[PDB]
Structure formats: structure tokens, C-alpha cells
Amino acid sequence: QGTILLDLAPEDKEYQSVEEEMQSTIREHRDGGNAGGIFNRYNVIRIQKVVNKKLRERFCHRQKEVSEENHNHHNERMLFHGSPFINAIIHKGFDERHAYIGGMFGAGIYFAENSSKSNQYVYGIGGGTGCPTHKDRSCYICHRQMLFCRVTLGKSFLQFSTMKMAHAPPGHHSVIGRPSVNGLAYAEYVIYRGEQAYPEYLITYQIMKPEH
């Protein structure tokens, strides 16, 4: 039994709540739109819920463990994740063994509370070379995907200056760093264990051109 993908109807309050959080967390990045493209709204064309019994059990077991090490607060949070491994992730779950040891904060899995930040990672670091078909980081044609996940943060460690960690600091279960661009800092939430994140919603969308 693998993963079941369930479509949510747009009139479903669940669909509406997820699209609302995605649309409303679009922020300015002072990058000129280089990484994720130029837009100020998304055309959300599909929202599917990822249902996988085995994964959920892995996740909840770990959330209990974190509860017990954090004075009964697992500190769960709904965060967005954009990357090129989404399809692999929805079928097998997050696997930290595939993590890049050279991340600003180490070999962990990264999340953000702003959908526009996550959109910058859909095609790779800094937006890589853009969509496969058009090699366009601001492609209005190709459908993108991003996950809205339940992330178990437990006790988070606030990191300012870069630190190439392999695991959460002793006594902690996640790392939160506030990175710099050309003035704006947005938080990055990092975990180092695949089971501290569950890919709740699979969002299929397109960025939209600023209207004329």
C-alpha cells in the first residue's frame, strides 16, 4: 500500500483554507523575480491530499517522542516546501539521507511559512535553470508543485550565522534561521529527520503574470 492522492473540490473548506494560505503568504523578495519568476498571484489548479497510512504512523510516533523530550509540546506547524524531489517525497516520504550537507544550515530538510519563498526552490537552488521544457524560471506555462506540510518542530534552535549541522543541536529538534537577501529576512525551518514532516497537501499551480 503506497500513497493515495485525493483531490479536494474547490468548494471544500479545506481546499479554500490551503489556497488562502498560499495566496496570502506571497511576499516581496527584492530579487527582481529571478529565482521564482515575476508574479503577485498564483493560479492554483489542483489541491490533493496525500494519504499514506505507513507514513502517518512514522510521523505520529516521532511526534510523540518529541513531545516526551520537549515537556509535552510537539510544536507542530503547517509549512510550505518547494523542491524538485516532491514526487519522490509524496510516495516514500521525506528521506533525510538525500539531504545536502552544504545547506546554509546543514544536511536537513527545509521549509518556509511564505509560499513565495518556497516557489524559489521548485526548480532547484536559486531557481536552477528553470522549468525543464522552457529553461524559464518565470515560466507561466508549466505547472509547478509545492507541499504544504505538517512539520514537527519540537524545541527549535535559533541560528543567526550559518552553521553546517548534521543534526539538531543537543536538546533541540529543529533549527530556524533568519537569512538575508537585499534587506528582507524570512525564516527557514529545518529538520534533520524525514519523519518530522508529513506532506499533507500537494498543490499544483502556475505563477501568473502581473496584469496589464
Total residues at the site for ligand 2GU (CB under 6 A)?
A: 24
Site membership for Zn ion, residue 60 (CB under 5 A): no
Where does residue 130 fall: left (phi above 0), alpha (psi -120 to 50 degrees), or beta otherwise?
left
C-alpha 114, offset from chain centre: 9
The amino acid sitting at 108 is G
Residues 134-153 that bind Zn ion (CB under 5 A): 134, 139, 141-142
DSSP 18: H
Rounded CA-CA distance 90/13 in Å is 23
Site membership for ligand 2GU, residue 120 (CB under 6 A): yes
Q: Which secondary-structure segment (H or E) carries 44?
A: strand 42-51
Rounded CA-CA distance 26/32 in Å is 14
Site membership for ligand 2GU, residue 195 (CB under 6 A): no
Record the cell numbers describing residue 95, joined without a space.
528521506
Of the pair 11, 160, the CB lying nearest ligand 2GU is at 160
Let me know: does 70 contact 173? Beta carbons within 8 Å.
yes
DSSP 97: G
Is 172 marked within a binding site? no
**67-96: b (≥16 Cβ within 10 Å) or e:** beebeeebbbeebbbbbeebeebbebbbeb
Cβ 42 to Zn ion, closest distance in Å? Answer: 15
Residues 73-102 that bind ligand 2GU (CB under 6 A): 80-83, 85, 88-89, 92, 94-95, 98-100
Cβ 137 to ligand 2GU, closest distance in Å? Answer: 13
Is 142 marked within a binding site? yes
Rounded CA-CA distance 149/78 in Å is 5
Site membership for Zn ion, residue 133 (CB under 5 A): yes
Site membership for ligand 2GU, residue 6 (CB under 6 A): no
**Which residues lie below 8 Å from residue 13, measured CB to CB, with a gap of 6+?**
none
Residues 154-193 that bind ligand 2GU (CB under 6 A): 188
**Residue 41, contacted partner among Zn ion, ligand 2GU, none, CB below 5-8 A by kind:** none
Query: Where do contacts with Zn ion occur on this chain (CB under 5 A)?
Result: 131, 133-134, 139, 141-142
Query: Where do contacts with ligand 2GU occur on this chain (CB under 6 A)?
Result: 80-83, 85, 88-89, 92, 94-95, 98-100, 103, 109-112, 117-118, 120-121, 188, 194
Known binding positions for Zn(2+): 131, 134, 139, 142
Known binding positions: 131, 134, 139, 142
